[PDB]
Amino acid sequence: KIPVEADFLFAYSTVPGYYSWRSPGRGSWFVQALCSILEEHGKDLEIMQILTRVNDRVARHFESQSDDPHFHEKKQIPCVVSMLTKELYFSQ
Amino acid sequence: ESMX
Amino acid sequence: QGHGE
């Protein structure tokens, strides 16, 4: 038998309890990052390597901008939840 | 930016 | 190190 909850992977744009940022002109930070990394390595990196790089890109490359000082210069860190039982590659 |  | 597919 195999556990019914096995082989799922959840890639959240942010951690539990936090907001997620989105740019009206460029799109959400997480998606911008995800597509960027996938365009470059979606065909040669394992899924966790890809999302880890996505984690780093969102964490370092983005900072919020708003007139309201309360939402000014805020950061974000994505969250990967894995129940996978094997390494995942999208090719070969 | 806005929040989601 | 070396993760190789």
Binding site: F8, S13, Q32 | - | -
Partner: protein
């Protein structure tokens, strides 16, 4: 071997739910920029080899039914499954245009016992949505 078997007729189905407009009663505002995300993701996943489908401004009932039906389809010839949700959210919850629905109920349709043709195959879910109202001020 330690890798998922990818030798199948096709990589798999990729469902994108792009929620931009919400009913006034929910208190949620338009998600400007979401069409750009949906566009980029579609090209990106089509490029990987997925058969991608894009839904727009879905109600909670529509999201549930849409995923339940996808899980009742035959995945025998697919290597995996991918689903991307773009919307407003709160902890453990995702917004439909008319309200809120538990993320767990959306993904449960694909458990091993309820979707046999995806058993032992990776089931991926990418979720762009808030999960609360805390802000990260950062450091250094």
């Amino acid at each position: 071997t330690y890798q998922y078997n990818m030798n199948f007729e096709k990589l798999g189905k990729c469902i994108i739910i792009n929620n931009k407009n919400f009913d006034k009663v929910t208190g949620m505002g338009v998600r400007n920029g979401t069409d750009k995300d949906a566009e980029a993701l579609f090209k990106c996943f089509r490029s990987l080899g997925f058969d991608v489908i894009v839904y727009n401004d879905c109600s909670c009932a529509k999201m549930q039914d849409l995923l339940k039906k996808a899980s009742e389809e035959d995945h025998t010839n697919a290597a995996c499954f991918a689903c991307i949700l773009l919307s407003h959210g709160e902890e453990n919850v995702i917004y439909g245009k008319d309200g809120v629905t538990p993320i767990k109920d959306l993904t449960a349709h694909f458990r091993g016992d309820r979707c046999k043709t995806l058993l032992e195959k990776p089931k991926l879910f990418f979720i762009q949505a808030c999960r609360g109202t805390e802000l990260d001020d950062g450091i250094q």
